Design an enzyme around this catalytic site. Structure first.
Site, PDB file in Angstrom:
ATOM      1  N   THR A   1       0.817  -1.253   0.000  1.00 29.18           N
ATOM      2  CA  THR A   1       0.000   0.000   0.000  1.00 29.18           C
ATOM      3  C   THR A   1       0.824   1.264   0.000  1.00 29.18           C
ATOM      4  O   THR A   1       1.786   1.409   0.761  1.00 29.18           O
ATOM      5  CB  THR A   1      -0.982   0.113   1.172  1.00 29.18           C
ATOM      6  OG1 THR A   1      -1.837  -1.031   1.153  1.00 29.18           O
ATOM      7  CG2 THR A   1      -1.873   1.344   1.118  1.00 29.18           C
TER       8      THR A   1
ATOM      9  N   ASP B   1      -3.159   3.742  -3.970  1.00 28.44           N
ATOM     10  CA  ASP B   1      -3.049   2.632  -4.931  1.00 28.44           C
ATOM     11  C   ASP B   1      -4.182   1.666  -4.635  1.00 28.44           C
ATOM     12  O   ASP B   1      -4.936   1.879  -3.701  1.00 28.44           O
ATOM     13  CB  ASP B   1      -1.682   1.930  -4.850  1.00 28.44           C
ATOM     14  CG  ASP B   1      -1.569   0.963  -3.670  1.00 28.44           C
ATOM     15  OD1 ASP B   1      -1.774   1.393  -2.517  1.00 28.44           O
ATOM     16  OD2 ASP B   1      -1.266  -0.227  -3.885  1.00 28.44           O
TER      17      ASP B   1
ATOM     18  N   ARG C   1      -3.833  -2.100  -4.707  1.00 23.91           N
ATOM     19  CA  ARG C   1      -3.402  -3.473  -4.486  1.00 23.91           C
ATOM     20  C   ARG C   1      -3.637  -3.929  -3.052  1.00 23.91           C
ATOM     21  O   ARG C   1      -3.343  -3.207  -2.090  1.00 23.91           O
ATOM     22  CB  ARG C   1      -1.904  -3.627  -4.799  1.00 23.91           C
ATOM     23  CG  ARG C   1      -1.342  -5.030  -4.563  1.00 23.91           C
ATOM     24  CD  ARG C   1       0.123  -5.083  -4.920  1.00 23.91           C
ATOM     25  NE  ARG C   1       0.344  -5.113  -6.367  1.00 23.91           N
ATOM     26  CZ  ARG C   1       1.506  -5.425  -6.962  1.00 23.91           C
ATOM     27  NH1 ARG C   1       2.598  -5.736  -6.250  1.00 23.91           N
ATOM     28  NH2 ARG C   1       1.594  -5.423  -8.293  1.00 23.91           N
TER      29      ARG C   1
ATOM     30  N   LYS D   1      -9.185   2.017  -1.273  1.00 26.03           N
ATOM     31  CA  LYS D   1      -8.520   2.410  -0.026  1.00 26.03           C
ATOM     32  C   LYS D   1      -8.869   3.818   0.469  1.00 26.03           C
ATOM     33  O   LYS D   1      -8.440   4.189   1.557  1.00 26.03           O
ATOM     34  CB  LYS D   1      -7.016   2.293  -0.197  1.00 26.03           C
ATOM     35  CG  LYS D   1      -6.582   0.902  -0.626  1.00 26.03           C
ATOM     36  CD  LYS D   1      -5.080   0.770  -0.633  1.00 26.03           C
ATOM     37  CE  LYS D   1      -4.650  -0.434  -1.451  1.00 26.03           C
ATOM     38  NZ  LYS D   1      -3.179  -0.667  -1.384  1.00 26.03           N
TER      39      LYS D   1
ATOM     40  N   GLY E   1      -2.567  -0.853   6.068  1.00 23.66           N
ATOM     41  CA  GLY E   1      -2.249  -1.759   7.159  1.00 23.66           C
ATOM     42  C   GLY E   1      -3.115  -2.983   7.036  1.00 23.66           C
ATOM     43  O   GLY E   1      -3.355  -3.442   5.944  1.00 23.66           O
TER      44      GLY E   1
ATOM     45  N   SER F   1       3.588   0.751   3.009  1.00 30.59           N
ATOM     46  CA  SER F   1       4.897   0.231   2.602  1.00 30.59           C
ATOM     47  C   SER F   1       5.574   1.078   1.528  1.00 30.59           C
ATOM     48  O   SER F   1       6.804   1.113   1.474  1.00 30.59           O
ATOM     49  CB  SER F   1       4.765  -1.207   2.116  1.00 30.59           C
ATOM     50  OG  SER F   1       3.840  -1.292   1.045  1.00 30.59           O
TER      51      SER F   1
ATOM     52  N   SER G   1       2.838  -2.327  -3.311  1.00 29.56           N
ATOM     53  CA  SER G   1       1.868  -1.438  -3.945  1.00 29.56           C
ATOM     54  C   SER G   1       1.711  -1.753  -5.394  1.00 29.56           C
ATOM     55  O   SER G   1       2.636  -2.219  -6.017  1.00 29.56           O
ATOM     56  CB  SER G   1       2.317   0.025  -3.814  1.00 29.56           C
ATOM     57  OG  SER G   1       2.387   0.422  -2.450  1.00 29.56           O
TER      58      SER G   1
HETATM   59 CL   LIG Z   1       1.049  -1.049   4.842  1.00 34.85          CL
HETATM   60  K   LIG Z   2       4.013  -8.674 -10.304  1.00 34.21           K
HETATM   61 MG   LIG Z   3       4.735  -2.408  -6.985  1.00 36.74          MG
END
Ligand SMILES: [Cl-]
Ligand SMILES: [K+]
Ligand SMILES: [Mg+2]
Ligand SMILES: [Cl-]
Ligand SMILES: [Cl-]
Ligand SMILES: [Cl-]
Ligand SMILES: [Cl-]
Ligand SMILES: [Cl-]
Ligand SMILES: [Cl-]
Ligand SMILES: [Cl-]
Ligand SMILES: [Cl-]
Ligand SMILES: [Cl-]
Ligand SMILES: [Cl-]
Ligand SMILES: [Cl-]
Ligand SMILES: [Cl-]
Ligand SMILES: [Cl-]
Ligand SMILES: [Cl-]
Ligand SMILES: [Cl-]
Ligand SMILES: [Cl-]
Ligand SMILES: [Cl-]
Ligand SMILES: [Cl-]
Ligand SMILES: [Cl-]
Ligand SMILES: [Cl-]
Ligand SMILES: [Cl-]
Ligand SMILES: [K+]
Ligand SMILES: [K+]
Ligand SMILES: [Mg+2]
Ligand SMILES: [Mg+2]
Ligand SMILES: [Mg+2]
Ligand SMILES: [Mg+2]
Ligand SMILES: [Mg+2]
Ligand SMILES: [Mg+2]
Lengths: 196, 123, 213, 4, 216, 202, 204, 201, 220, 203, 196, 4, 4, 4
Positions: free
Chosen positions: I1, I17, I19, I33, I47, I129, I169
């Protein structure tokens, strides 16, 4: 360490269990019974941790008997099996889990004979045959090889005897004697012990 | 540790230290072997005779294992060493193969032990 | 606890044809949640007939392939011929086992031609267990790639389908599809797919773009 | 790695 | 080294048309203490090759000692062969891998920059012997903070001029001063070209703190 | 973090750096660690950001209600006491190093330290946070009895500038506040305004 | 790992005006198969099914307790529950056990009881829901299943093509996982009917 | 893994499944677990794959040198002991090998079980691997020294089959061999899927 | 994220993002999100996914109760308090890392909120992240009082930085633009990643899968 | 322990506290942590007493033999190098934080730090030991370029007095030494001779 | 898990050992021999860790045989027992310890019959009777109760049978068969296996 | 976690 | 142990 | 447990 086995034929269930109570390196009892009568057509075979096995089994037993008394008729094997599961599963993440493994065998006027397998986590599965304990590792493949759904009770007692002989031959534990019982339309019958 | 090459070639392809070892054999007491139909016999000359000798202690016929024995001629001290090396080896074969040695196996082992002592430094 | 390993990612694949071998890999080199580089292939030329794919701990990938290169020249010097694909595979097994108690953290797949001119794939575990295969995936996304290959190349679980020989074109379309599907889900697999085709004419190289996220 |  | 002591943070590197530039701050941290505030973490290896090191500074000084002695040894022969940047990078991979494999690593992550035979070289080696090349590199916190900026520029424009690469490196060094608690605003820039290896410093970035009044 | 407070005749000076860290990433480069608890009572916060924010919000509530009940400005010693009570009672569950400083009409300018563990002690001046280790010597040598307000501000900015130079865990801008009968005066020393001391090059 | 103790795999897949949900039939305890006809997919309505892979005890408990909640909802409301609303119900049930969760990751497949619009989703073991327009997977061979689904699934498939695709994705996925298989069962959910099939499948 | 062997009047039967795994991932369904040490000696593989292959290949090397030095076939007892003594040095270092050495020599049909723990024992029947308990059950109930050859092939094949059914870590195909007095033969390779079609309560 | 927020001349721009991962595998490619808190307040979540969903829902719900009672537009400080006090109570066990942004009677406000209950009030923030990648873009390029399109460019650039440099992400960029006059919920804002096309076709025809048992159960 | 050394034009000043601890017992109150390695090269020792004594004895031997071989006074940089080599090579087995300082005819007055881990760096002035944490600020604010010898002695005694006040692990007497071409001048500041700074009692 | 027993009478030593080779839950061999012939009048009975037991016993065996070959006469039981101890004790703090427990039984022309007990630590003790393994816990009191130094061999075989019966009755392991041998002036004799 |  |  |  404890062995349970059940074989369900078209109109009966045959069950057996070892008769040893062990502690450390010794057998303390050679006529131990691991079967509990819930009702006229239901046995519960229970093994596992000391204390937990009897405390659990007897609690189920008394509650199934209480149901008969409140209502005038008995729980079906399936209903008793699901009652047993509910309790085990409800207790699983509690302060008082029960470390027990079980078979429930029974005959119902309408559904016929039934065998149920339950582990300590409280997964419940219906099965044509089943076994618990280390001995199950040596005997389940013998049941897969020779069992058929039409198996007669004379032949089921023979199949059982092959399994118990395999334990004499190949299993490292001294399990010299077994309780054998069968359930059908006319209730619970005691067959002769199988001994060596 | 002493690394001198002792056994070396001489100009006409001789190994003089081996030839000289052979001369030590020829000065030893005579030993004879005969392979019978279902028996094998070893006989060997005097040693010294001598009335004051303890016969038992100087035999030149020696068990290697239950099914193999040997006689020798030459330096008796050298023989004792070879014999003990073979005795040890008979027990290692029994250990790793669970059969007694064949006579050829242990002959082959004694022979390669001798060969090694003609091509190794310091010996 | 210093750890001497780290996972750097990478997915490898080899397919054996009747007269060809394919060895394919993605080009991403990772560490933790980061990308080191987008252009770090995992295929290495061994001979005119043999290619090897390597993934796992990159430190070991580099060291092992340099050992293999040295062993091939030594072989050629002692025996006056190039190592066969099969001999390389047999040798690699012994090299991997030499470090049985401190393994090369590497997943290896060899693709090449055998002595009759036919496709050959050999696949390895980190300590040198190996065998010959018709086709094999390895590394990060292997569990994503292998089942589709079992189905489409091995014809598994399919009834009433002619078990025809695998054409290069179809083998090639498959290789691209499985990597594109892996790129959707495995976070390590991406950036670009590098394909080596080994034939009697030699080794040629295709490259196709994968997702950069 | 792998087991049998 | 099992336990690092005085340590250095990020090293940055980026290729440009005709050379390679690398950057590193001049700080040896002892845990969180900024202990030695005027150390070089960059090494002129030879005329075509330079080296920058993150991690344990005593291990870097050992590598400097070893590698400096190797280039002297070679210069003594006066035979017309020199270690290329690529060869130095290879040597370094082997030495790191070898020390890793004895469970006694040299606790560094390194960026080799070079220029030889018209080609720019930039390569990375870590304490485990992980090594590769790339158009830009950033160790430590630079991997998280500096590299995203470097690669975003390099995608829009792969071929940078020398002053473009220099301005991009200064921008990255600013970001690291803002966000890496082990960084310091006193750094060197080292450039390799046709003309050899220059090390400039001490340098500082301008900083903005307008956001201190935007507690918004 | 580095935090500091100094008593003068009529008031107090408080100071902090502006750095918030997770590991060695800087989550906030312009943090405001000097939080108002009442009209003329501030706390300087070090340790856990979550803990010191929660504790400071709780004391602010306690003190505001107290102050309305009594219908008088609160005592600085009472603010310190409320901090002490909560920091001591919850010492095993909190990571908080606090300086409480302000002015009240009864005792004038006061500085109280409530360090981890939750003791409370009144001081001429106080320092806390990770960075404070690097300035014990300096403040021990520089502190003079009877400093004016401007002198206290200079002393504070110097000490924090020095700590910030050496402590990786401190940095950013220096935030100062002066509290006296007349009110609260806040300011930021940033960039070239932060006192400078040469790196000792050869 | 707790989730590998009994093994198992479920997936669901979307088609034109139809959905499919599938599951392996093995009930085992680590290496040992106990039974080869274990129920993992449970009806929650005439056109709405929940598939649960994970710890077998909680597969059953979650199914049963969800049923409890569902039956009460339907008696109390006027009506059959919508797919999206069942998801939220499951989500809520699992998140109640946030700090000691049920070890199951359900998948839901159905048609909306008024519109007949296709719905599929899955949830993690603390109730994070996840709706998709293609497919969802859950179990010990999730990577295998992802490989098969990402390569085979296409949009707007009819009941016969959807059946073949979900069956091929299941059979080939579980054939690469030691602790899933011993049979596969597939339900195809249409407006006017439910087709239930067991597949010819490896029994090792 | 499931493997088994037994001695009977007409030699020694040797059978195995063909599955290999990395954890729960099925790595292969085509592994040859019976190794051809020489034309009258087989070895079987259960445990770590690399460990078994390597050490049994090394056994084969050693048996061949022996034959060249001694001008005769190595015995089943001696070969099994070479393997035992090789692996003994490595106890507690994490080798995982469970093998059967199967042959015919001057003492007749021969069968030794040998493993990485240090065991080396001779016996009439053995089963080895994660599935062995399942195979012992059926093997034990059908075994006899006076089994006819085809009956013995059926027993071995069924015992492995039944092991593949219960044990998650066994499967693929059953590969069956027969050590006779003039050398071993490869009797059959049957996929478990094809055997399920066939069998047989 | 990767999630992020920016205060611009007239409002807030939030970004995220799309994902979601289970370990090092992508579970969801297009997960949302940026959460509704109130019509004038949104919150990006990073998280533990369930925790960010259930935490933002609960607070939104309590704010609806609050604003239903007051008859007034909710304030960003109120959302910030409620979140931080709950998160603090749970001692970090609710793994919710939040970027809270909105516009109220006192203007635009942006907070970051951490699992343990600390918050920072700032003109730009990042979490997840990919937050260092996103933050590098903000330190390089943020200016005060940006126009709307500048702010949107900058936030989408910051999310992209996370998407491409963080394995955590990926997939799309979502934005939410909040001002006194406007709410633009832009999902997707950008789709910088696309699956490659399938070269070969695996249309398995009817009968390909062997079937053991069949039951048709008709419905109404 | 607190140790310190300062360069001036023509020489160096070295200083140390005199405390040796086991846990919080003081095994020696009047320790001499400034040890002579040659005629005009000293080391200041912090960390393990056993380690720094053994290392200092070994370098003394190495350098004394080196110096007889060359028949010249040793370089300060050579003493520092020998310390570095041993402290770096045996970094996993030693706990030693060293300052090497002295005078030689080639480079004059020099101060080298060899901290734990065994790096080596030349400095205008150096501080080490547990107590040095408490004087970074002070020395950063006080150090002036171009200090005379007497100024360096005063600076050193002040800094050590401050550290000793705060660090439980430092204390006792201050030992100073000045090293220049003309030789070595040692002294002890004890009791009332140690610079004093008021505890900040309340108005 | 392995059972050894020895009973020394006035002019013989009677020994027995179980015949099971176990691995995990199964018996893998039921005709296992745990006795090693060292010489014409010496048996070494060895149990313990896999690998170690045979490697140790056979190394002793080959060395005792080698002594016979070097010297033309055999080691006495006492000398062989002390030889065995020396090796075990020397290896105890080495890289290659052996986790074995032993009895050594033998007959010497001059000292008569002898039984020796040795544990893995290499404590050596002479005894009129002794046993190893968990089974020893159930059988040593039976030997203490009925043994006398004058016990005849007919009666020692009976005493042995009581011990082996006690293991059938009371021990939790399945040890169905035992090797029995006796040593006297005329060497080592095989008596019939004792079986159940 | 997050500190000052 | 004993330190300075 | 899914993460973002
Ligand atoms: Cl995270
Ligand atoms: K990939
Ligand atoms: Mg990536
Ligand atoms: Cl023999
Ligand atoms: Cl410095
Ligand atoms: Cl340099
Ligand atoms: Cl804060
Ligand atoms: Cl504090
Ligand atoms: Cl504190
Ligand atoms: Cl702090
Ligand atoms: Cl900062
Ligand atoms: Cl419930
Ligand atoms: Cl096969
Ligand atoms: Cl040989
Ligand atoms: Cl044996
Ligand atoms: Cl196995
Ligand atoms: Cl059969
Ligand atoms: Cl707030
Ligand atoms: Cl002292
Ligand atoms: Cl000392
Ligand atoms: Cl000396
Ligand atoms: Cl130090
Ligand atoms: Cl130091
Ligand atoms: Cl110290
Ligand atoms: K700082
Ligand atoms: K002191
Ligand atoms: Mg309990
Ligand atoms: Mg806390
Ligand atoms: Mg499977
Ligand atoms: Mg199986
Ligand atoms: Mg020491
Ligand atoms: Mg051992």
């Amino acid at each position: 360490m404890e062995y349970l086995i059940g074989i369900q034929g078209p109109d009966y269930v045959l069950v057996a269990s070892d008769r040893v109570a062990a502690s450390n390196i010794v057998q303390m009892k050679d006529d131990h019974d691991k079967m509990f009568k819930m009702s006229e057509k239901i046995l519960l075979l229970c093994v596992g941790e000391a204390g937990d096995t009897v405390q659990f089994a007897e609690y189920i037993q008394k509650n199934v008997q209480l149901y008969k008394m409140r209502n005038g008729y008995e729980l079906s094997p399936t209903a008793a099996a699901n009652f047993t599961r509910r309790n085990l599963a409800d207790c699983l993440r509690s302060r008082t889990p029960y470390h027990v493994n079980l078979l429930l065998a029974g005959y119902d006027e309408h559904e016929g004979p039934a065998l149920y397998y339950m582990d300590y986590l409280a997964a419940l599965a219906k099965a044509p045959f089943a076994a618990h304990g280390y001995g199950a590792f040596l005997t389940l493949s013998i049941l897969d090889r020779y069992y058929t759904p039409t198996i007669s009770r004379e032949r089921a007692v023979e199949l059982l005897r092959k399994c118990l002989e395999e334990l004499q031959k190949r299993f490292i534990l001294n399990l010299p004697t077994f309780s054998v019982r069968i359930i059908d339309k006319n209730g619970i019958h005691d067959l002769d012990n199988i001994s060596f | 540790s002493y690394d001198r090459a002792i056994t070396v070639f001489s100009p006409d392809g001789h190994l003089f230290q081996v030839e000289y070892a052979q001369e030590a054999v020829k000065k030893g007491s005579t030993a004879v072997g005969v392979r019978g139909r279902d028996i094998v016999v070893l006989g060997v000359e005097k040693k010294s005779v001598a009335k004051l000798q303890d016969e038992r202690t100087v035999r030149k016929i020696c068990a290697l294992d239950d099914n193999v024995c040997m006689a020798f001629a030459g330096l008796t001290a050298d023989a004792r060493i070879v014999i003990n090396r073979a005795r040890v080896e008979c027990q290692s074969h029994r250990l790793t193969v669970e059969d007694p040695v064949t006579v050829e196996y242990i002959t082959r082992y004694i022979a390669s032990l001798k060969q090694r002592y003609t091509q190794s430094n310091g010996r | 606890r210093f750890s001497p390993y780290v996972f750097n990612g990478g997915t490898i694949l080899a397919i054996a044809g009747e007269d060809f071998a394919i060895v394919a890999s993605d080009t991403r080199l990772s560490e933790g949640f980061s990308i080191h580089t987008r252009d770090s292939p995992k295929c290495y030329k061994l001979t005119d007939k043999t290619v090897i794919g390597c993934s796992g701990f990159h430190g070991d990938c580099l060291t092992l392939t340099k050992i293999i290169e040295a062993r091939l020249k030594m072989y050629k010097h002692s025996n006056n011929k190039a190592m066969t694909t099969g001999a390389i595979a047999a040798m690699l097994s012994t090299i991997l086992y030499s470090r049985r108690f401190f393994p090369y953290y590497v997943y290896n797949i060899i693709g090449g031609l055998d002595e009759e001119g036919k496709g050959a794939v050999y696949s390895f575990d980190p300590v040198g267990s190996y065998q010959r295969d018709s086709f094999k995936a390895g590394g990060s996304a292997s569990a994503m790639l292998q089942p589709l290959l079992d189905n489409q190349v091995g014809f598994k679980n399919m009834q009433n389908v002619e078990h025809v020989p695998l054409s290069l074109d179809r083998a090639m379309r498959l290789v691209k599809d499985v990597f594109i599907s892996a790129a959707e889900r495995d976070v390590y697999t991406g950036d670009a797919l590098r394909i080596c085709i080994v034939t009697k004419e030699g080794i040629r190289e295709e490259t196709v773009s994968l997702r950069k996220d | 790695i792998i087991t049998x | 080294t099992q336990n690092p002591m005085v340590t250095g943070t990020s090293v940055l590197g980026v290729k440009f048309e005709g050379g390679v530039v690398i950057a590193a701050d001049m700080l040896g941290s002892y845990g969180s203490l900024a202990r030695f505030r005027n150390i070089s973490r960059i090494m002129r290896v030879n005329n075509s090759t330079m080296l920058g090191a993150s991690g344990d500074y005593a291990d870097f000084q050992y590598l400097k000692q070893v590698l400096g002695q190797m280039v002297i040894d070679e210069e003594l022969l006066g035979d017309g062969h020199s270690y290329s940047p690529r060869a130095i990078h290879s040597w370094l991979t082997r030495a790191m891998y070898s020390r890793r494999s004895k469970m006694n690593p040299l606790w560094n992550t390194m960026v080799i920059g070079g220029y030889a035979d018209g080609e720019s070289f930039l390569g990375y080696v870590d304490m485990l012997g992980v090594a590769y090349e790339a158009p830009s590199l950033a160790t430590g916190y630079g991997a998280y903070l500096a590299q995203p900026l470097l690669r975003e520029v390099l995608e829009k424009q792969p071929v940078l001029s020398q002053t473009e690469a220099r301005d991009l490196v200064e921008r990255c060094m600013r970001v690291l001063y803002y966000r890496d608690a082990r960084s310091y605003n006193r750094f060197q820039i080292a450039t390799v070209t046709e003309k050899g290896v220059e090390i400039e410093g001490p340098l500082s970035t301008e900083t903005n703190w307008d956001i201190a009044h935007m507690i918004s | 973090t580095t935090i500091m407070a100094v008593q003068f005749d009529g008031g107090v000076v408080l100071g902090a750096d502006s750095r918030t860290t997770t590991g060695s990433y800087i989550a906030n480069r312009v943090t405001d660690k000097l939080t108002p608890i009442h009209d003329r009572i501030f706390c300087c916060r070090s340790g856990s950001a979550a803990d010191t924010q929660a504790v400071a919000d709780a004391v602010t509530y306690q003190l505001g209600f107290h102050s309305i009940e009594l219908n008088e400005p609160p005592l600085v010693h009472t603010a310190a006491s409320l901090f002490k009570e909560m920091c001591y009672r919850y010492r095993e569950d909190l990571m908080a190093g606090i300086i409480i400083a302000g002015w009240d009409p009864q005792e004038g300018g006061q500085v109280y330290s409530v360090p981890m563990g939750g003791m409370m002690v009144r001081q001429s001046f106080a320092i806390g946070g990770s960075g404070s280790s690097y300035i014990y010597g300096y403040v021990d040598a520089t502190y003079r009895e009877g400093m004016t307000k401007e002198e206290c501000l200079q002393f504070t900015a110097n000490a924090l500038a020095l700590a910030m130079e050496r402590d990786g865990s401190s940095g950013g801008v220096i935030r100062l506040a002066a509290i006296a009968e007349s009110g609260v005066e806040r300011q930021v020393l940033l960039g070239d305004q932060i006192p400078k001391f040469a790196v000792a090059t050869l | 790992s707790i989730m590998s103790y009994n093994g198992g795999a479920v997936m669901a897949m979307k088609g034109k005006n139809c959905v499919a949900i599938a599951a392996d039939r093995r009930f085992g305890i680590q290496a040992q198969m106990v039974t080869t006809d274990f129920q993992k997919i449970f009806p929650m309505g005439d056109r709405l099914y929940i598939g649960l892979a994970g710890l077998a005890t909680d597969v059953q408990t979650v199914a049963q307790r969800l049923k409890f909640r569902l039956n009460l909802y339907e008696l109390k409301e006027g009506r059959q529950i919508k797919p999206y609303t069942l998801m939220s119900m499951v989500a809520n049930l699992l998140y109640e056990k946030r700090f000691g969760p049920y070890y199951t990751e359900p998948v839901i497949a159905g048609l909306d009881p008024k519109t007949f619009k296709p719905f599929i989703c899955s949830l993690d073991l603390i109730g994070c829901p996840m709706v998709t327009d293609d497919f969802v997977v859950s179990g010990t061979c999730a990577e295998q299943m992802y490989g098969m689904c990402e390569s085979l699934w296409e949009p707007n498939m009819d009941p016969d093509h959807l059946f073949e695709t979900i069956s091929q994705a299941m059979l080939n996925a579980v054939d690469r996982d030691a602790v899933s298989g011993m049979g596969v069962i597939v339900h195809i959910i249409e407006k006017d009917k439910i087709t239930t099939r067991t597949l010819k499948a490896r029994m090792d | 893994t499931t493997t088994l062997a037994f001695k009977f009047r007409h030699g020694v039967i040797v059978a195995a499944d063909s599955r290999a795994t990395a954890g729960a991932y099925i790595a292969s369904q085509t592994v040859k677990k019976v190794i051809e040490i020489n034309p009258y000696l087989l070895g079987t593989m259960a445990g770590g794959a690399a460990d078994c292959s390597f050490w049994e290949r090394l056994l084969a090397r050693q048996c061949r040198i022996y034959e060249l030095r001694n001008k005769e076939r190595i015995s089943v007892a001696a070969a099994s002991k070479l393997l035992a003594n090789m692996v003994y040095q490595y106890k507690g270092m994490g080798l995982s090998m469970g093998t059967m050495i199967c042959g015919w020599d001057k003492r007749g049909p021969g069968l030794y079980y040998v493993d990485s723990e240090g065991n080396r024992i001779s016996g009439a029947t053995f089963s080895v691997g994660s599935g062995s308990v399942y195979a012992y059950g059926v093997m034990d109930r059908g075994y006899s020294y006076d089994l006819e050859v085809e009956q013995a092939y059926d027993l071995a094949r069924r015992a492995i089959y039944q092991a593949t059914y219960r044990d998650a870590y066994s499967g693929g195909a059953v590969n069956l061999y027969h050590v006779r007095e003039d050398g071993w033969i490869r009797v059959s390779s049957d996929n478990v899927a094809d055997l399920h079609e066939k069998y047989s309560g | 994220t990767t999630i992020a927020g920016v205060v611009y001349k007239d409002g807030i721009v939030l970004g995220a993002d799309t994902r979601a991962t289970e370990g090092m595998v992508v579970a969801d490619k297009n997960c949302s999100k940026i959460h509704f808190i109130s019509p004038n307040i949104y919150c990006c979540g990073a998280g533990t996914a369930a925790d960010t969903d259930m935490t933002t829902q609960l607070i939104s719900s309590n704010l609806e109760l609050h604003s239903l009672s007051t008859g007034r537009l909710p304030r960003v400080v109120t959302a910030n308090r409620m979140l931080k006090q709950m998160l603090f109570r749970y001692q970090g066990y609710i793994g919710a890392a939040l970027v809270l942004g909105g516009v109220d009677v006192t203007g635009p406000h942006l907070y970051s909120i951490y699992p343990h209950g600390s918050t920072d009030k700032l003109p730009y923030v990042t979490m997840g992240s990919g937050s260092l990648a996103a933050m590098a873009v903000f330190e390089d390029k943020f200016r005060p009082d940006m126009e709307e399109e500048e702010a949107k460019n900058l936030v989408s650039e910051a999310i992209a930085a996370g998407i491409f440099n963080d394995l955590g992400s990926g997939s799309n960029i979502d934005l939410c633009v909040i001002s006194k006059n406007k709410l633009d919920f832009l999902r997707p804002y950008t789709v910088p990643n696309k699956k490659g096309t399938r070269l070969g076709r695996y249309r398995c025809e009817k009968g390909t899968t062997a079937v053991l048992t069949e039951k048709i159960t008709p419905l109404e």
